[PDB]
Amino acid sequence: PSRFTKTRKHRGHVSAGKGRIGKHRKHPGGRGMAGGQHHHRINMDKYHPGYFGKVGMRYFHKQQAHFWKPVLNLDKLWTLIPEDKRDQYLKSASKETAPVIDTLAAGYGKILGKGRIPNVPVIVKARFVSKLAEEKIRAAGGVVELIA
Amino acid sequence: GAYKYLEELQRKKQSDVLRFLQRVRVWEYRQKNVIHRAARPTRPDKARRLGYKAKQGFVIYRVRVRRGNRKRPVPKGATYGKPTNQGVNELKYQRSLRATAEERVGRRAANLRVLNSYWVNQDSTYKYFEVILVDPQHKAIRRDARYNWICDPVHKHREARGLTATGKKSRGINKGHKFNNTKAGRRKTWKRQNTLSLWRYRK
């Protein structure tokens, strides 16, 4: 809506908010990022540290498939159970019956350990795990089956 | 059959016999006109696997194209621009000598259709080609469901549009990661991925 803009408050004033000395002109500081080493340097340093230069190895033909490894902390990992069935497992938690959580079914590539699942034994299928992730699972009374 | 023997003999082009024939033939053509009528293929089985048949309405022409590179013409070598573009002599002309040959017969007989062409010979000054041309308004080809696709109008002047066999190489048309730049054609895929696609509801 142009009825709300401020150049519809600037009608009648000569210079339209751009000042009478410096005026307003086409490109005072060059087009785009020009002068980034030279007259804009003080700007690039402070607010773009690290802009110039090269860090490490190139990678030819990179594909984000190989690198797909979503992560699911032990924070959640009980969300993957149906909330209607879920409270059946929390109460009456024993072995010989334990929930099989397939974390790849839900799109997760690795089970991390961020913290404190409850004391219920649980069977967790995962591609990858972390050293702390199992220690908390395995001490909860469950195990980690690896899959592919 | 007799064509598996002729096939292999023409794969030895430095064999003492063929480098005799190449030398007697190249003298033959260089006396004849630059484009002239070949009463009969010089390589019956070379034309034959390219779609040639022996019947009325399959015609063979013999074409002699100048050799070397393309000289960007210009008056007196002055390109008038950046020294990047100031090159004259070494520029190589993005179509081939073979496809230039299929182009110059396709103009001379315009009632016919260029089916293919093959390499008959070469020397320092020229290369020599034979172009297999079909005559679509002849009644033999109009019937015979095998060859009547060339009578349809979309096949007019296949060489100039680059639809022949050697012109689909120059256009860089193949399947694979190597041909990504020109695959469905260059200017069509360049123009698809510069296109700014603005939907009604802006995503």
Binding site: - | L198, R200, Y201, R202
Partner: protein
């Protein structure tokens, strides 16, 4: 290529039409549009389906 149409969240779009439906009751807001309702038996006005 001026933006013509506009996206509205489907849950908020639904939020409005459930206010506009709750607002066809409450006689006082009907009169504020016109809609002479003074004579009608009550509101909401429910007619036998035979219509």
């Amino acid at each position: 290529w001026r933006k013509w149409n506009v996206k509205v969240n489907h849950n908020e779009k639904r939020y409005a039409t459930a206010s506009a439906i709750a607002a066809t009751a409450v006689a006082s807001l009907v009169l504020a549009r016109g809609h002479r309702v003074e004579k009608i038996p009550e509101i909401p006005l429910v007619v036998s389906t035979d219509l």
